């Protein structure tokens, strides 16, 4: 707002990195797991390279530069950062690898060892991430568990910016002509009016909590995307996760408030899960909670968040 944005965009020649394997593939493009080796510095930084499908229009292409723009410019522990971009005919964005994949996946793999302290911390981190975006006047528009990456099980980050939009000083809303959207994560207004606001994200934040508390369950499983709005109006809502006390579920519920301004706010959500964080057991009941807490896996390739700073 006042401060100059000295976020640095580095540009990398495609020969600076190599692609080992592919994690994700989509019409949108392909994202590879690979290594980045800046010349001279000898280090190998594990990264995810997202190679994007050829730009059909200038507009499509222009939005690719927007994504990178926000992503390079955003620094917070809990949001992903662009490491660098590469301007081949099909651009590639280089990002730090999240060695564990997307939380969505993680919870499904270890429900057995997932414990209360973890789930609440995750919430807090996700809420911190999101709050930061609110601070920067950005609307994510795609929060979901799939969209949360796991750096280390103890640490997570918000990941997807394909749909992120930055807001005008005079703007408290974003309106979208069209696209492809994940309905079951959307606030009724967005589905009804393609109106997006930080509060529409909060709704998502909640579907995201539900995902995590039900260890990977699908929102409105069996129900088709078509009527999500119907039932949403009629008052239906995702049920209480078996693990959840009313206190925690009650927060998921407020998120799904129809009135946008009756929904919690990220800064609040932070403090509240932060509070439940200290005495996790009291709020989330997990059975046996007391119980719980590339080419080569390592090759003189210690890197990433560490390379950038002291
Ligand atoms: C679960 C959501 C998802 O699919 N996430 C995802 C898929 C592909 C690519 C990226 O980008 C990305 N990924 C990572 N780390 C990462 C992501 C995904 C995985 N997977 C997902 C697919 N299963 C089959 C294999 C493991 C693994 C990852 O680390 C290896 N880091 C950064 C980025 Cl941008 C996300």
UniProtKB/Swiss-Prot annotation:
The associated disease is:
Lung cancer: A common malignancy affecting tissues of the lung. The most common form of lung cancer is non-small cell lung cancer (NSCLC) that can be divided into 3 major histologic subtypes: squamous cell carcinoma, adenocarcinoma, and large cell lung cancer. NSCLC is often diagnosed at an advanced stage and has a poor prognosis. Neonatal nephrocutaneous inflammatory syndrome: An autosomal recessive disorder characterized by intrauterine growth retardation, premature birth, fragile skin, recurrent skin infections and sepsis, failure to thrive, nephrocalcinosis, and nephromegaly with tubular dysfunction. Some patients have chronic diarrhea, and necrotizing enterocolitis.
Annotated organism of origin:
Homo sapiens
Which part of the full protein does this chain span, and how long is the full protein? 696 to 1020 of 1210
Q: Which segments of the protein form a coiled coil according to its record?
A: none
Summarizing the annotation, the consequence of altering residue 29 to S is:
Found in a lung cancer sample
Impact when changing residue 138 to V: Found in a lung cancer sample; more sensitive to gefitinib than wild-type
Q: What is the designated name of this protein? A: Epidermal growth factor receptor
Subcellular location(s): the record lists: Cell membrane; Endoplasmic reticulum membrane; Golgi apparatus membrane; Nucleus membrane
Give all residue intervals belonging to the Protein kinase domain: 17-284
> What does this chain do?
Receptor tyrosine kinase binding ligands of the EGF family and activating several signaling cascades to convert extracellular cues into appropriate cellular responses. Known ligands include EGF, TGFA/TGF-alpha, AREG, epigen/EPGN, BTC/betacellulin, epiregulin/EREG and HBEGF/heparin-binding EGF. Ligand binding triggers receptor homo- and/or heterodimerization and autophosphorylation on key cytoplasmic residues. The phosphorylated receptor recruits adapter proteins like GRB2 which in turn activates complex downstream signaling cascades. Isoform 2 may act as an antagonist of EGF action.
Biological processes annotated in GO: cell morphogenesis; cell surface receptor signaling pathway; cell-cell adhesion; cellular response to amino acid stimulus; cellular response to epidermal growth factor stimulus; cellular response to estradiol stimulus; cerebral cortex cell migration; digestive tract morphogenesis
Does the record carry Cell inner membrane as a key word?
no
Q: What is the effect of changing residue 282 to A?
A: Reduced phosphorylation
Reported impact of residue 163 to M: Found in a lung cancer sample
Impact of altering residue 306 to F? 50% decrease in interaction with PIK3C2B. 65% decrease in interaction with PIK3C2B. Abolishes interaction with PIK3C2B
């Amino acid at each position: 707002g006042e401060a100059p944005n000295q976020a640095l965009l580095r540009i990398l020649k495609e020969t600076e990195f190599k692609k080992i394997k592919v994690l994700g593939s989509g019409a949108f493009g392909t994202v590879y797991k690979g290594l980045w080796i800046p010349e001279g510095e000898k280090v190998k930084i594990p990264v995810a390279i997202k190679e994007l499908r050829e730009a059909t229009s200038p507009k499509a292409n222009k939005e690719i530069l927007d994504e990178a723009y926000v992503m390079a410019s955003v620094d917070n522990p809990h949001v992903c950062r662009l490491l660098g971009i590469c301007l081949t005919s099909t651009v590639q964005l280089i990002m730090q690898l999240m060695p564990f994949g997307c939380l969505l996946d993680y919870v499904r793999e270890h429900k057995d060892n997932i414990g209360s302290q973890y789930l609440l911390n995750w919430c807090v981190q996700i809420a911190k991430g999101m709050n930061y975006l609110e601070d920067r006047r950005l609307v994510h528009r795609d929060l979901a568990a799939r969209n949360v990456l796991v750096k280390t099980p103890q640490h997570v980050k918000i990941t997807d910016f394909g749909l992120a939009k930055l807001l005008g000083a005079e703007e408290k809303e974003y309106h979208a002509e069209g696209g492809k959207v994940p309905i079951k994560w959307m606030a009724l207004e967005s589905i009804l009016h393609r109106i997006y606001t930080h509060q529409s994200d909060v709704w998502s934040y909640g579907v995201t909590v539900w995902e995590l508390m039900t260890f990977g369950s699908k929102p409105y499983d069996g129900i088709p995307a078509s009527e999500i709005s119907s039932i949403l109006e009629k008052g239906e809502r995702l049920p209480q996760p078996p693990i959840c006390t009313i206190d925690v579920y009650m927060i998921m519920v407020k998120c799904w408030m129809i009135d946008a301004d009756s929904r919690p706010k990220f800064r609040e959500l932070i403090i509240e899960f932060s509070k439940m964080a200290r005495d996790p057991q009291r709020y989330l009941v997990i059975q046996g909670d007391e119980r719980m807490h590339e080419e080569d896996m390592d090759d003189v390739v210690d890197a990433d968040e560490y390379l950038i700073p002291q």
